[PDB]
Every structure is written in structure tokens, then in C-alpha cells.
């Protein structure tokens, strides 16, 4: 979310939010949780 503020200020797209709350799930001990963030940052890079 700090990289997302940097994005929403280098460009002016205050509406664009890429990080979703669903990355962690306690049912499955939060396994795989980081690979959703990796995908979300790859979207934040490619849209930039």
C-alpha cells in the first residue's frame, strides 16, 4: 500500500486501487498469501 500511494501520486489516478483485502485467509492458514501480492504488484508495474 505504500507503493500504491507512490503510484497514485506519480500518476493522478486516485481511483485506481489494486491491493484487495482477500490476500489472506485464516481457513487455510494463509497459505500462498504472498503470491497474490506478487501478482498484484506485477499488475501495478504493467499498468504503469
Amino acid at each position: 500500500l505504500m507503493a500504491e500511494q507512490a503510484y497514485r501520486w506519480e500518476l493522478n489516478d486516485d481511483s485506481a486501487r489494486f491491493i484487495k483485502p482477500g490476500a489472506w485467509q485464516g481457513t487455510y492458514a494463509g497459505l500462498l498469501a504472498g503470491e497474490t501480492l506478487m501478482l498484484s504488484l506485477a499488475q501495478m508495474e504493467d499498468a504503469h
Binding site: 492458514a29 500462498l32 497474490t36 501478482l39 506485477a42
Partner: protein, 49 residues
Amino acid sequence: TSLKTQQEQTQSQLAFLQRKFSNQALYNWLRGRLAAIYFQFYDLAVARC
């Protein structure tokens, strides 16, 4: 009596296989979630190439 005990021991082991974490349903969820991530991330990779 010995054979009847073995029936219970097989039921206890089957129950442990169903009740543990790291069971079938966790791996099914991991496969589905990872496959969806994998295809999205492939579309990003090929766009970059």
C-alpha cells in the same frame, strides 16, 4: 474380537485422514487458486515479452 478391533482401527485412521489439516480439500483449494494466479501472471509475462 481381534477382527472387530481392526474395523475400529481402520475407522480411526480414516477419520484422521479426513480431519487433519493438509488434507484433500486444502490441496484442491491450492490447485484452483494457484492455477488462476498462474494464468493471469502468464498474460502479464507475455505482454512484457
